[PDB]
Amino acid sequence: KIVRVGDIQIGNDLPFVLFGGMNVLESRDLAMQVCEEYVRVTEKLGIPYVFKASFDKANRSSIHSFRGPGLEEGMKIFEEIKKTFKVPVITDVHEPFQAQPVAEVCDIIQLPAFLSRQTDLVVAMARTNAVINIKKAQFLAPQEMKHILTKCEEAGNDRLILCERGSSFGYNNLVVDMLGFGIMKQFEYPVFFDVTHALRRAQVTDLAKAGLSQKLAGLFLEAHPLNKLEAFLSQLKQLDELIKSFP
Amino acid sequence: AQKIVRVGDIQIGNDLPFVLFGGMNVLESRDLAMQVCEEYVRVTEKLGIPYVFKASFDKANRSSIHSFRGPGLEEGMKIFEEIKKTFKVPVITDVHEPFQAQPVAEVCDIIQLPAFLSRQTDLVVAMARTNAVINIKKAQFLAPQEMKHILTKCEEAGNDRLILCERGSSFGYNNLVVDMLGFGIMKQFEYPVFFDVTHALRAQVTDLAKAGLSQKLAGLFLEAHPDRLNKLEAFLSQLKQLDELIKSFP
Amino acid sequence: AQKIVRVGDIQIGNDLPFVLFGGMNVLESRDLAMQVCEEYVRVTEKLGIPYVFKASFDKANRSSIHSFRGPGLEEGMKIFEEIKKTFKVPVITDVHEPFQAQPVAEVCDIIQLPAFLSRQTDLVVAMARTNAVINIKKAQFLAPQEMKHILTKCEEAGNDRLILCERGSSFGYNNLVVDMLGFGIMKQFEYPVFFDVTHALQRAQVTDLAKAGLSQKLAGLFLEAKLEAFLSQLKQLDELIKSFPAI
Amino acid sequence: QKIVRVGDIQIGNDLPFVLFGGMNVLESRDLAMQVCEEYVRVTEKLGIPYVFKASFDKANRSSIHSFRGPGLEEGMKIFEEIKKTFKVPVITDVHEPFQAQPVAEVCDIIQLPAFLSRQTDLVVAMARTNAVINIKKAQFLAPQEMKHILTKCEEAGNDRLILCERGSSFGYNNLVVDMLGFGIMKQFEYPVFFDVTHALRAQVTDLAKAGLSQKLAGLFLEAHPDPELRLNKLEAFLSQLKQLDELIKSFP
């Protein structure tokens, strides 16, 4: 029900926790800059924070023309971010062997939606007793999440978080079914919602709001310099406080 | 520009406090309706929620024949006059055959175009004559953007007093999903945007209504019964609180 | 066991050769109604394909209050009487209001119950009372098994001369996808099942779907318009699929 | 319209359909050869080109425990037998990039799983082996989106591609097959297959007839001795499909 990561506490009954950061570690310079701006706002408003970014992008369109810095170099950037900002990090691992080294640097490891069924990957990630973030596949029903949490508990990892990213709706279109948050919460694991990955900036705000009204452990953001974050997160903190106060 | 629609002392719009279209599904008995309306008027007066009473006089799109449909038109419009007298408060019902558009609008301030029938011309025009306010139900197979053409018809049939209702969307077979992004898109057409929470499917109703209201909406559509009605106060409290928050955001 | 619906000297049935319900969208003009039907009778006569002329005397769902609607009831009937006289062919039309069911069923052999109006009791009942053939249109939001209620309504109201007709299902927004398994599911109710090839759209594409729909062993086709070559392939296909013993 | 040749088998949307049939997974050395033998007898007797189908690992499942298959090295020895015994090409699914290379050494056609059809590394590894790639269409991807994966293979060294249809997402835990999908995917000129058994009763029969009426290059079947399709009942059903394929193919 509650998941501790350093000193940050994560639960559906607790104030929401930002998972914000980048799509991909472009450079060390941007990683630090993005991360610095995020801590500044979140510390101002009193929102517990974790830095998000991939080191590897699987779904690219070229043999080698930019998945990001890779396992060795990405890990060195996460290591520097942890030093400077004393903040937990989160990244997603793609191949089974990477889970072990990555869990040593990264506090939370993410389980990509497309690969969420692959047994071997699940187990590799569970072995590391680091906290696993299960991304919910767009062709999957909330009930199906139970089996993914089971393999995890059977491999002896019971620090798990569900992160919703929207269901498939006809061709190419996605819809976020809000009743799914509820069905997922019965599993007693913290639930998150990925807002940027579920689809102007008007939409992102509306959808983020609509997610927190369902009473969630937290949120995903890929923002990039944005720097209009203060107005946005404050409304969310206000709403979340209202929402979590309800019997 | 955002649009404001006015009825018997009531301000309905996307930027204003949310309005309740609440009552019962169908007019079962002249007595039961009073009961329900009474309980509604108590909580709404308290919470400062502009309330309109809601109930259909005929359940046409029935599942089976010989099933209870309701009191019919005339029988039913009487029961509407009684609630309207006793509780001094507007009424909304759905009208199914074009001919009944005028008698009904004599009694009811607001008339509701049923989803299945939203596409068909004769009835739309018939409601637009009555210079009443037309509650347009969105159908589960219509895209939000497609609401534009129903808006257009009514405007061109001589009514500019319009509300859109979201009722849900088709999601495989016998399942409905409510796209939150839809409200954004419909809000652009100006005209208040309401949400039917009941007909979008216990406590899933509370979740869904909360999700709705976060989108900054003109009002809710909602159904209750003594066999539910009892836990109305606790439910609308939270909602109003949240609405107070969303509507104050700059 | 499977039901045969008999209209004129024509048999309709999921086992009997397919029947074309071909014709036009709206009765544009008398002369234009005659022309289309002439071309249909000739081409369907040449091949071995039972034919029934289809058309609307009223377009109730047109976008804009001012856009052409058709000849209306009395005028619409006079063009159907003329078609009957000239071509000695049964007709099908859709009925929009309860009071129409009788005068229409006096001229028209088959009456069609449009989707959207497909659940209104007062029209279904009105239409069943006329002892014409009911062509029940399948709504794109309604599951195939859901067609029992509409059938039952009709049966109770005193009419078992029924046909279900498939126009597609809602797939996300605006898109319609035709669930081939639907035909099996509706087939079990034993009334003749048709497919609306044209209204399953929004090309060669109409042809492909027509082929796919006919491979499921169907009472007929619903088509609006080399028509001759189109049907000839379909006639051959219908012949192959219908000679197949059960596996 | 391209034509993919494997051994003496022509594969193509204008050509006679090709059966990619076998079983779900290599439950054993024995059961493999029993399924293959039945397919081969009915194949020769009907004269329909045939490619044996079996997975060597069931990489995703519900529970971690128990059965997933023989494994890579074990599983390929079965494929060694089957090739040697019955003179028939084989097809399996590759799940990780390091596998594509030793899998192609034995299997004539490799299958890029639906879920992993987007992950570049697997695609590239496979396209290096020059063996035929059968790209599974993802349940959440529009037929139009199959161009990018084709382009990833062809720009990578390999233009011997098959597309495959497994059904699209239709609500929760439920699928529909879009028939207009076939005619869209065909516009890319590679051959297009339908996986009737992954698209979900004898309603597999009905789907296959539905697919084959779209003038496809071919089709997927799984059949078993005892389901915990029936392996002994293929002839009457494959026969019906050939007469239908022969018809659909003859049309101008």
Side-chain angles (χ1 to χ4, degrees), chain B residues 10 14 22 31 46 56 69 93 99 102 111 147 156 159 199-201 207 219 222 229:
Chain B
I10 273 159
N14 292 316
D31 284 9
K46 196 172 192 224
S56 37
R69 310 219 308 193
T93 188
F99 68 73
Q102 196 74 69
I111 60 194
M147 280 298 94
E156 78 173 38
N159 202 317
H199 293 292
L201 264 167
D207 274 342
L222 171 87
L229 198 74

PDB file of all heavy atoms in Angstrom, chain B residues 10 14 22 31 46 56 69 93 99 102 111 147 156 159 199-201 207 219 222 229:
ATOM      1  N   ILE B  10     -32.187  30.906 -13.105  1.00  0.00           N
ATOM      2  CA  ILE B  10     -31.019  30.028 -13.009  1.00  0.00           C
ATOM      3  C   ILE B  10     -29.986  30.314 -14.104  1.00  0.00           C
ATOM      4  O   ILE B  10     -30.306  30.374 -15.280  1.00  0.00           O
ATOM      5  CB  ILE B  10     -31.455  28.538 -12.971  1.00  0.00           C
ATOM      6  CG1 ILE B  10     -31.757  28.091 -11.503  1.00  0.00           C
ATOM      7  CG2 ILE B  10     -30.389  27.598 -13.548  1.00  0.00           C
ATOM      8  CD1 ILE B  10     -32.662  26.831 -11.526  1.00  0.00           C
ATOM      9  N   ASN B  14     -20.534  27.162 -18.617  1.00  0.00           N
ATOM     10  CA  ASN B  14     -19.347  26.365 -18.383  1.00  0.00           C
ATOM     11  C   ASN B  14     -18.392  26.966 -17.351  1.00  0.00           C
ATOM     12  O   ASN B  14     -17.603  26.248 -16.731  1.00  0.00           O
ATOM     13  CB  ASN B  14     -18.636  26.078 -19.702  1.00  0.00           C
ATOM     14  CG  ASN B  14     -19.448  25.165 -20.597  1.00  0.00           C
ATOM     15  OD1 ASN B  14     -20.012  24.157 -20.144  1.00  0.00           O
ATOM     16  ND2 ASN B  14     -19.556  25.541 -21.871  1.00  0.00           N
ATOM     17  N   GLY B  22     -31.128  16.725 -11.849  1.00  0.00           N
ATOM     18  CA  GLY B  22     -31.259  15.503 -11.067  1.00  0.00           C
ATOM     19  C   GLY B  22     -32.727  15.211 -10.839  1.00  0.00           C
ATOM     20  O   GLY B  22     -33.505  16.118 -10.683  1.00  0.00           O
ATOM     21  N   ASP B  31     -46.653  10.409  -6.352  1.00  0.00           N
ATOM     22  CA  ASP B  31     -46.127  10.599  -4.980  1.00  0.00           C
ATOM     23  C   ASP B  31     -44.602  10.478  -4.901  1.00  0.00           C
ATOM     24  O   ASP B  31     -43.929  11.359  -4.360  1.00  0.00           O
ATOM     25  CB  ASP B  31     -46.837   9.704  -3.928  1.00  0.00           C
ATOM     26  CG  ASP B  31     -48.276  10.250  -3.556  1.00  0.00           C
ATOM     27  OD1 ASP B  31     -48.769  11.205  -4.223  1.00  0.00           O
ATOM     28  OD2 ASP B  31     -48.913   9.708  -2.584  1.00  0.00           O
ATOM     29  N   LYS B  46     -29.276  23.869   0.358  1.00  0.00           N
ATOM     30  CA  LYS B  46     -28.180  23.856   1.304  1.00  0.00           C
ATOM     31  C   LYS B  46     -26.837  24.130   0.609  1.00  0.00           C
ATOM     32  O   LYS B  46     -26.152  25.130   0.897  1.00  0.00           O
ATOM     33  CB  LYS B  46     -28.170  22.514   2.032  1.00  0.00           C
ATOM     34  CG  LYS B  46     -27.334  22.513   3.304  1.00  0.00           C
ATOM     35  CD  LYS B  46     -27.499  21.222   4.093  1.00  0.00           C
ATOM     36  CE  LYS B  46     -26.885  21.387   5.463  1.00  0.00           C
ATOM     37  NZ  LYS B  46     -26.064  20.152   5.826  1.00  0.00           N
ATOM     38  N   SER B  56     -38.522  11.470 -16.854  1.00  0.00           N
ATOM     39  CA  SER B  56     -39.168  11.264 -18.159  1.00  0.00           C
ATOM     40  C   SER B  56     -40.584  10.737 -17.991  1.00  0.00           C
ATOM     41  O   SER B  56     -40.846   9.875 -17.125  1.00  0.00           O
ATOM     42  CB  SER B  56     -38.315  10.364 -19.082  1.00  0.00           C
ATOM     43  OG  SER B  56     -37.636   9.277 -18.328  1.00  0.00           O
ATOM     44  N   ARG B  69     -43.908   1.667 -18.696  1.00  0.00           N
ATOM     45  CA  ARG B  69     -43.299   2.766 -19.444  1.00  0.00           C
ATOM     46  C   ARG B  69     -43.404   4.088 -18.700  1.00  0.00           C
ATOM     47  O   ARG B  69     -42.456   4.872 -18.697  1.00  0.00           O
ATOM     48  CB  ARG B  69     -43.892   2.884 -20.852  1.00  0.00           C
ATOM     49  CG  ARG B  69     -43.922   1.555 -21.599  1.00  0.00           C
ATOM     50  CD  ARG B  69     -43.570   1.701 -23.081  1.00  0.00           C
ATOM     51  NE  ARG B  69     -44.381   2.720 -23.751  1.00  0.00           N
ATOM     52  CZ  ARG B  69     -44.436   2.855 -25.075  1.00  0.00           C
ATOM     53  NH1 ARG B  69     -43.766   2.029 -25.864  1.00  0.00           N
ATOM     54  NH2 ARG B  69     -45.179   3.799 -25.614  1.00  0.00           N
ATOM     55  N   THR B  93     -37.576  17.203 -19.100  1.00  0.00           N
ATOM     56  CA  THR B  93     -37.956  15.881 -19.547  1.00  0.00           C
ATOM     57  C   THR B  93     -37.480  15.652 -20.989  1.00  0.00           C
ATOM     58  O   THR B  93     -37.071  16.588 -21.694  1.00  0.00           O
ATOM     59  CB  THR B  93     -39.482  15.671 -19.375  1.00  0.00           C
ATOM     60  OG1 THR B  93     -39.819  14.307 -19.643  1.00  0.00           O
ATOM     61  CG2 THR B  93     -40.321  16.557 -20.331  1.00  0.00           C
ATOM     62  N   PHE B  99     -44.676  15.644 -32.332  1.00  0.00           N
ATOM     63  CA  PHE B  99     -45.943  16.300 -31.955  1.00  0.00           C
ATOM     64  C   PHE B  99     -45.986  16.739 -30.486  1.00  0.00           C
ATOM     65  O   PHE B  99     -46.683  17.711 -30.152  1.00  0.00           O
ATOM     66  CB  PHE B  99     -47.208  15.468 -32.328  1.00  0.00           C
ATOM     67  CG  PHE B  99     -47.363  14.185 -31.531  1.00  0.00           C
ATOM     68  CD1 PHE B  99     -47.750  14.215 -30.178  1.00  0.00           C
ATOM     69  CD2 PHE B  99     -47.145  12.947 -32.135  1.00  0.00           C
ATOM     70  CE1 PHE B  99     -47.887  13.045 -29.445  1.00  0.00           C
ATOM     71  CE2 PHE B  99     -47.288  11.771 -31.404  1.00  0.00           C
ATOM     72  CZ  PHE B  99     -47.655  11.820 -30.061  1.00  0.00           C
ATOM     73  N   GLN B 102     -44.491  20.543 -28.234  1.00  0.00           N
ATOM     74  CA  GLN B 102     -45.138  21.817 -27.849  1.00  0.00           C
ATOM     75  C   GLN B 102     -45.911  21.744 -26.522  1.00  0.00           C
ATOM     76  O   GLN B 102     -45.647  22.563 -25.608  1.00  0.00           O
ATOM     77  CB  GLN B 102     -46.063  22.359 -28.976  1.00  0.00           C
ATOM     78  CG  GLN B 102     -46.477  23.828 -28.836  1.00  0.00           C
ATOM     79  CD  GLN B 102     -45.337  24.804 -29.180  1.00  0.00           C
ATOM     80  OE1 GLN B 102     -44.907  24.928 -30.355  1.00  0.00           O
ATOM     81  NE2 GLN B 102     -44.837  25.504 -28.147  1.00  0.00           N
ATOM     82  N   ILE B 111     -36.378  21.028 -22.618  1.00  0.00           N
ATOM     83  CA  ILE B 111     -36.633  19.734 -23.302  1.00  0.00           C
ATOM     84  C   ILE B 111     -35.415  18.957 -23.861  1.00  0.00           C
ATOM     85  O   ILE B 111     -34.494  19.549 -24.460  1.00  0.00           O
ATOM     86  CB  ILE B 111     -37.729  19.847 -24.377  1.00  0.00           C
ATOM     87  CG1 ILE B 111     -37.328  20.875 -25.453  1.00  0.00           C
ATOM     88  CG2 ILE B 111     -39.098  20.136 -23.713  1.00  0.00           C
ATOM     89  CD1 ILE B 111     -38.475  21.303 -26.360  1.00  0.00           C
ATOM     90  N   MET B 147     -20.746  16.985 -32.792  1.00  0.00           N
ATOM     91  CA  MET B 147     -21.795  17.658 -32.064  1.00  0.00           C
ATOM     92  C   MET B 147     -22.120  18.990 -32.710  1.00  0.00           C
ATOM     93  O   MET B 147     -23.226  19.498 -32.576  1.00  0.00           O
ATOM     94  CB  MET B 147     -21.382  17.806 -30.603  1.00  0.00           C
ATOM     95  CG  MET B 147     -21.596  16.521 -29.809  1.00  0.00           C
ATOM     96  SD  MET B 147     -23.333  15.976 -29.715  1.00  0.00           S
ATOM     97  CE  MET B 147     -23.494  14.817 -31.069  1.00  0.00           C
ATOM     98  N   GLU B 156     -30.281  26.881 -36.900  1.00  0.00           N
ATOM     99  CA  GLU B 156     -30.919  27.176 -38.158  1.00  0.00           C
ATOM    100  C   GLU B 156     -32.410  26.833 -38.181  1.00  0.00           C
ATOM    101  O   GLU B 156     -33.098  27.168 -39.129  1.00  0.00           O
ATOM    102  CB  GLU B 156     -30.145  26.518 -39.308  1.00  0.00           C
ATOM    103  CG  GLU B 156     -30.370  25.025 -39.513  1.00  0.00           C
ATOM    104  CD  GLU B 156     -29.685  24.537 -40.786  1.00  0.00           C
ATOM    105  OE1 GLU B 156     -28.562  25.032 -41.085  1.00  0.00           O
ATOM    106  OE2 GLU B 156     -30.283  23.670 -41.500  1.00  0.00           O
ATOM    107  N   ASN B 159     -33.554  28.146 -32.585  1.00  0.00           N
ATOM    108  CA  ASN B 159     -33.240  28.090 -31.170  1.00  0.00           C
ATOM    109  C   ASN B 159     -31.733  28.192 -30.990  1.00  0.00           C
ATOM    110  O   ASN B 159     -30.986  27.436 -31.624  1.00  0.00           O
ATOM    111  CB  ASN B 159     -33.774  26.771 -30.599  1.00  0.00           C
ATOM    112  CG  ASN B 159     -33.979  26.846 -29.094  1.00  0.00           C
ATOM    113  OD1 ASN B 159     -33.144  27.381 -28.352  1.00  0.00           O
ATOM    114  ND2 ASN B 159     -35.088  26.284 -28.636  1.00  0.00           N
ATOM    115  N   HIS B 199     -26.287   7.325 -16.671  1.00  0.00           N
ATOM    116  CA  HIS B 199     -26.467   6.617 -17.959  1.00  0.00           C
ATOM    117  C   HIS B 199     -25.142   6.391 -18.703  1.00  0.00           C
ATOM    118  O   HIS B 199     -25.128   6.210 -19.927  1.00  0.00           O
ATOM    119  CB  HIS B 199     -27.478   7.340 -18.884  1.00  0.00           C
ATOM    120  CG  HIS B 199     -28.897   7.331 -18.385  1.00  0.00           C
ATOM    121  ND1 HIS B 199     -29.661   6.180 -18.311  1.00  0.00           N
ATOM    122  CD2 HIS B 199     -29.699   8.342 -17.965  1.00  0.00           C
ATOM    123  CE1 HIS B 199     -30.863   6.480 -17.848  1.00  0.00           C
ATOM    124  NE2 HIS B 199     -30.912   7.785 -17.631  1.00  0.00           N
ATOM    125  N   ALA B 200     -24.043   6.405 -17.945  1.00  0.00           N
ATOM    126  CA  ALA B 200     -22.704   6.209 -18.469  1.00  0.00           C
ATOM    127  C   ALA B 200     -22.168   4.874 -17.939  1.00  0.00           C
ATOM    128  O   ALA B 200     -20.954   4.643 -17.885  1.00  0.00           O
ATOM    129  CB  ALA B 200     -21.818   7.372 -18.061  1.00  0.00           C
ATOM    130  N   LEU B 201     -23.102   3.996 -17.563  1.00  0.00           N
ATOM    131  CA  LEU B 201     -22.782   2.674 -17.027  1.00  0.00           C
ATOM    132  C   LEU B 201     -23.891   1.665 -17.348  1.00  0.00           C
ATOM    133  O   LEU B 201     -24.221   1.464 -18.545  1.00  0.00           O
ATOM    134  CB  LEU B 201     -22.553   2.762 -15.508  1.00  0.00           C
ATOM    135  CG  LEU B 201     -21.092   2.886 -15.043  1.00  0.00           C
ATOM    136  CD1 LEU B 201     -20.988   3.292 -13.558  1.00  0.00           C
ATOM    137  CD2 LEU B 201     -20.318   1.584 -15.331  1.00  0.00           C
ATOM    138  N   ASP B 207     -16.911   8.399  -8.458  1.00  0.00           N
ATOM    139  CA  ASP B 207     -15.630   8.519  -9.182  1.00  0.00           C
ATOM    140  C   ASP B 207     -15.814   9.293 -10.486  1.00  0.00           C
ATOM    141  O   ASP B 207     -15.052  10.208 -10.807  1.00  0.00           O
ATOM    142  CB  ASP B 207     -15.072   7.118  -9.533  1.00  0.00           C
ATOM    143  CG  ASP B 207     -14.242   6.489  -8.392  1.00  0.00           C
ATOM    144  OD1 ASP B 207     -13.803   7.210  -7.468  1.00  0.00           O
ATOM    145  OD2 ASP B 207     -14.007   5.253  -8.441  1.00  0.00           O
ATOM    146  N   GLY B 219     -22.728  21.459 -15.694  1.00  0.00           N
ATOM    147  CA  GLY B 219     -23.553  20.777 -14.729  1.00  0.00           C
ATOM    148  C   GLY B 219     -23.524  19.256 -14.901  1.00  0.00           C
ATOM    149  O   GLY B 219     -22.863  18.719 -15.806  1.00  0.00           O
ATOM    150  N   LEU B 222     -28.282  13.392 -13.295  1.00  0.00           N
ATOM    151  CA  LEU B 222     -28.169  12.361 -12.250  1.00  0.00           C
ATOM    152  C   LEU B 222     -29.503  11.786 -11.771  1.00  0.00           C
ATOM    153  O   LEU B 222     -30.488  12.504 -11.609  1.00  0.00           O
ATOM    154  CB  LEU B 222     -27.349  12.869 -11.037  1.00  0.00           C
ATOM    155  CG  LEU B 222     -27.376  11.922  -9.835  1.00  0.00           C
ATOM    156  CD1 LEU B 222     -26.273  10.878  -9.969  1.00  0.00           C
ATOM    157  CD2 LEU B 222     -27.205  12.710  -8.542  1.00  0.00           C
ATOM    158  N   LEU B 229     -31.106   7.534  -2.868  1.00  0.00           N
ATOM    159  CA  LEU B 229     -31.584   8.903  -2.561  1.00  0.00           C
ATOM    160  C   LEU B 229     -31.111   9.391  -1.198  1.00  0.00           C
ATOM    161  O   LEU B 229     -30.918  10.611  -0.970  1.00  0.00           O
ATOM    162  CB  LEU B 229     -33.109   8.916  -2.539  1.00  0.00           C
ATOM    163  CG  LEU B 229     -33.821  10.267  -2.663  1.00  0.00           C
ATOM    164  CD1 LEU B 229     -33.728  10.769  -4.091  1.00  0.00           C
ATOM    165  CD2 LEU B 229     -35.278  10.152  -2.213  1.00  0.00           C
TER     166      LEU B 229
END
